[PDB]
Amino acid sequence: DIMLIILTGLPGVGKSTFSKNLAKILSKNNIDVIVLGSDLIRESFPVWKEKYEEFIKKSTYRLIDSALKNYWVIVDDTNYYNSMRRDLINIAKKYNKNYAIIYLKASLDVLIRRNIERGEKIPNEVIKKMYEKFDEPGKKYKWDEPFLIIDTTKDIDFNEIAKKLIEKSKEIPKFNISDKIDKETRKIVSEYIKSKKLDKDKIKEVVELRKEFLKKIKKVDADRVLKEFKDLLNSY
Amino acid sequence: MGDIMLIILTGLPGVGKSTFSKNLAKILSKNNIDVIVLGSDLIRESFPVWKEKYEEFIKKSTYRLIDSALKNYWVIVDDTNYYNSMRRDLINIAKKYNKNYAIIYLKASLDVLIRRNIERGEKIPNEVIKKMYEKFDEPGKKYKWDEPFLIIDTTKDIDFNEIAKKLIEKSKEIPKFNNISDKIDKETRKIVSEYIKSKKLDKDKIKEVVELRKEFLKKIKDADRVLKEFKDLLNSY
Numbered sequence: 001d002i003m004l005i006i007l008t009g010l011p012g013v014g015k016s017t018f019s020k021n022l023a024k025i026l027s028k029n030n031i032d033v034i035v036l037g038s039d040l041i042r043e044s045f046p047v048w049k050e051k052y053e054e055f056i057k058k059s060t061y062r063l064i065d066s067a068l069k070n071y072w073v074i075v076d077d078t079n080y081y082n083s084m085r086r087d088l089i090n091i092a093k094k095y096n097k098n099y100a101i102i103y104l105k106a107s108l109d110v111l112i113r114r115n116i117e118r119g120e121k122i123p124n125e126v127i128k129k130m131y132e133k134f135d136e137p138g139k140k141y142k143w144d145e146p147f148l149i150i151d152t153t154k155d156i157d158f159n160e161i162a163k164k165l166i167e168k169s170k171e172i173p174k175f176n177i178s179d180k181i182d183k184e185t186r187k188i189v190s191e192y193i194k195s196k197k198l199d200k201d202k203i204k205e206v207v208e209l210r211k212e213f214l215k216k217i218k219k220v221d222a223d224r225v226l227k228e229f230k231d232l233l234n235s236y
Numbered sequence: 237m238g239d240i241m242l243i244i245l246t247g248l249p250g251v252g253k254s255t256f257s258k259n260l261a262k263i264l265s266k267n268n269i270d271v272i273v274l275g276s277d278l279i280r281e282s283f284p285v286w287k288e289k290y291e292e293f294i295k296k297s298t299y300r301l302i303d304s305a306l307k308n309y310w311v312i313v314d315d316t317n318y319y320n321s322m323r324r325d326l327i328n329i330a331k332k333y334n335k336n337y338a339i340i341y342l343k344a345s346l347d348v349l350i351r352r353n354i355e356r357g358e359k360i361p362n363e364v365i366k367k368m369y370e371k372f373d374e375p376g377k378k379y380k381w382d383e384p385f386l387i388i389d390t391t392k393d394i395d396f397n398e399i400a401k402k403l404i405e406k407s408k409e410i411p412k413f414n415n416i417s418d419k420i421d422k423e424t425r426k427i428v429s430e431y432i433k434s435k436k437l438d439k440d441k442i443k444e445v446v447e448l449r450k451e452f453l454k455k456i457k458d459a460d461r462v463l464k465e466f467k468d469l470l471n472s473y
């Protein structure tokens with residue numbers, strides 16, 4: 001009776017806080033659960049470099065795979081693209097475990113204010129673009145439909161959620177390069193902004209630069225594309 | 237630049253391993269070295285509670301992360317590494333990939349260890365730190381492969397530029413190369429620490445339990461059965 005819980009939701013929506021609260025209640029019910037997410041490995045490097053992301057991603061999948069043989073796993077990650085949620089569901093599929101996607105939502109104004117209170121580590125402008133561009137889960141594939149959609153500005157009943165997940169766990173389980181380029185150019189942009197401490201007008205400019213660059217890319221070799229993106233930001 | 241190296245920390249709780257790791261990782265990265273800091277607490281602290289049955293998973297997961305990382309990055313192993321068997325296991329990972337390694341032994345006076353502990357809410361009982369201090373075998377006491385590359389006094393300022401220089405020099409060199417008792421010693425200590433913390437034992441109950449453990453370990457001298465019995469003993473007591 002092991003299940004895979006897949007969080008999804010934009011930066012600052014409260015994934016990690018929700019993960020820790022849910023884990024506490026599950027363990028109260030004598031469920032063995034582990035919270036795993038890419039930041040565990042990413043933040044173990046003293047700096048960020050794009051070449052680290054492959055190791056970060058694989059390491060995170062490996063831990064989840066190993067963990068899910070013996071424990072419930074809560075995947076604490078933005079999981080912005082359907083391709084990521086697919087990779088995770090395929091881990092559950094490998095071991096015939098049930099899974100539940102839990103989509104955490106909040107308005108853009110809430111995410112911005114939360115970002116501001118945590119020291120605006122990711123740029124506000126970047127959260128705004130992510131918000132505009134986000135394809136909400138379940139809008140394409142039936143396997144991607146959320147088990148729960150949770151408004152994190154309203155009271156959340158963790159006992160009820162726990163009850164529902166343990167019920168689900170007893171049920172019979174039923175079952176991109178463009179994404180990488182999109183994901184890493186965004187991270188590169190955020191890092192440059194933070195590194196070079198760009199002003200608000202410069203921030204708008206580089207976010208717009210990225211948008212234009214990606215239109216050109218679309219209308220590919222990832223490493224060449226990302227290297228050129230870096231060179232472009234430097235040039236600009 | 238050139239080569240990859242495994243850096244193995246060792247030292248008692250509160251000595252400053254995690255702080256040292258972050259400072260060292262920063263100076264290595266400043267020199268364009270790709271380095272990652274990995275320790276068993278990454279995985280241990282991802283569970284909402286501690287249970288002894290998690291530890292084998294925690295151990296194996298951590299070794300697998302270290303193994304996978306060392307293929308591409310310097311790795312700083314941020315763990316107490318209280319037993320020489322642990323330092324052996326880590327060295328065998330370096331050996332498997334023919335990578336240099338360096339044990340860095342961090343030290344401080346019992347005095348300072350306790351003050352630091354206290355300064356963090358006594359997350360581990362002071363009495364337990366004391367007992368670890370007494371029973372600790374310093375690296376290199378027995379095997380030459382176990383000898384510290386550096387011994388750092390954390391009671392004093394640390395020259396990280398000097399340390400980075402020495403490690404980088406080491407990394408260009410040509411590399412040269414029961415635990416059931418450790419497991420029981422280790423988990424009974426953790427169980428004791430957990431009981432003290434969760435039943436808020438007073439100072440005197442703490443001493444009895446610490447002594448209870450040593451007596452127990454003398455009598456016992458497979459791990460699951462023995463550990464279940466130890467828990468039963470503490471409950472009974």
Ligand SMILES: Nc1ncnc2c1ncn2[C@@H]1O[C@H](COP(=O)(O)OP(=O)(O)NP(=O)(O)O)[C@@H](O)[C@H]1O
Binds near residue numbers: 011013
């Ligand atoms: N349910 C909630 N209600 C109010 N505030 C919250 C809630 N959840 C999280 N927060 C606050 O929002 C901020 C971000 O929360 P966190 O749990 O770190 O979000 P996250 O989605 O995990 N962020 P990230 O890891 O960067 O994508 C923190 O400062 C929290 O205190």
Ligand SMILES: Nc1ncnc2c1ncn2[C@@H]1O[C@H](COP(=O)(O)OP(=O)(O)NP(=O)(O)O)[C@@H](O)[C@H]1O
Binds near residue numbers: 249252255316352391
């Ligand atoms: N060199 C130092 N000088 C003064 N204080 C220090 C030093 N190193 C660490 N500390 C402080 O001591 C406390 C414990 O440091 P930490 O780096 O967590 O130790 P640790 O060895 O990693 N502990 P643990 O993970 O429990 O084995 C922290 O509050 C530090 O700020």
Ligand SMILES: [Mg+2]
Binds near residue numbers: 016076
């Ligand atoms: Mg988070």
Ligand SMILES: [Mg+2]
Binds near residue numbers: 253254255314
């Ligand atoms: Mg530490």
